[PDB]
């Protein structure tokens, strides 16, 4: 049985967190697959490197250790939704973030509580590549449990995330996240009139989830 411990993010975790996020997203992420070609592994690591110091300073993020091997198997990256760094993104990931803001912005700024320390934004999650399905499932349950604990302990009102894969969408639902938007990703229109995810099947959704704590 997999037994785990959540440790707050520290400055020396940078490369381990990057390796997990890159391995967890590059050529796997459900939105970026439609921007091919031109999704580079360094596009993800460039973003994390720009935000790394503030990410650690805000003290809302954590890694998950396997306490039997003392190695990191997962990580949850969080910010206050109203107090997030903005990075100029020179990569094609900028369209993903603009799409996510298209989903989140209207809901966040007009329907969720105003002020800082209200909305805990679950920004990225990931698990190590070598985890088998039992370990992956267990680590995701452990990270969801721990995001809730951080939210309560840090006195946030709730947890806000856009879930873009079927697994994270279904996990959100069994953890009783409320659906605020279920958007068909192939209908999103970029500023140049194109549809960057237009080739995606009609069934691929971006679901904006919210859970009060
Ligand atoms: N949490 C938003 C899902 C996502 C996709 N790509 C990057 N992030
Ligand atoms: Ca999520």
Q: Is the dihedral of CA 201, 30, 181, 97 positive or negative?
A: negative
Cα of 165 to ligand 1 centre, how many Å? 9
CA dist., res. 197 & res. 194, Å (int): 9
Residue with the smallest CA separation from ligand 1 atom 4 is 164
Cα of 27 to ligand 1 centre, how many Å? 13
Cα of 167 to ligand 1 centre, how many Å? 13
Residue with the smallest CA separation from ligand 1 atom 2 is 162
Ligand nearest, relative to CA of residue 159: 2
Q: Which atom of ligand 1 is nearest to the CA of 32?
A: 6
Q: What is the resolution of this structure in A?
A: 2.1
Number of CB atoms found within 10 A of residue 28's CB: 12
Q: Which atom of ligand 1 is nearest to the CA of 124?
A: 1
* Experimental determination technique: X-ray
């Amino acid at each position: 049985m997999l037994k785990m411990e959540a440790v707050p993010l520290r400055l020396e975790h940078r490369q381990e967190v990057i390796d997990i996020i890159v391995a967890s997203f590059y050529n796997k992420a459900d939105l970026e697959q439609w921007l091919k070609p031109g999704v580079l592994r360094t596009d993800y690591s460039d973003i994390l490197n720009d935000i790394w110091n503030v990410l650690v300073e805000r003290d809302l993020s954590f890694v998950v250790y396997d306490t039997n091997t003392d190695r990191i198997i997962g990580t949850a990256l969080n910010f206050d939704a109203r107090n997030e760094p903005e990075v100029d993104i020179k990569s094609k990931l900028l369209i993903v973030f603009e799409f996510l803001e298209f989903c989140e912005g209207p809901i966040r700024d007009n329907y969720l509580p105003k002020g800082l320390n209200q909305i805990l934004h679950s920004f990225m999650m990931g698990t190590a590549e070598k985890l088998n399905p039992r370990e992956n499932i267990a680590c995701m349950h452990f990270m969801e449990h721990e995001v809730l604990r951080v939210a309560r302990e840090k006195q946030f009102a709730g947890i806000f995330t856009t879930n873009t894969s079927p697994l994270t969408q279904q996990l959100a639902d069994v953890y009783h996240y409320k659906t605020l938007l279920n958007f068909q990703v192939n209908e999103y229109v970029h500023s140049d009139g194109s549809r960057p995810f237009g080739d995606a099947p009609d069934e691929q959704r971006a679901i904006v989830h919210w859970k009060e704590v």
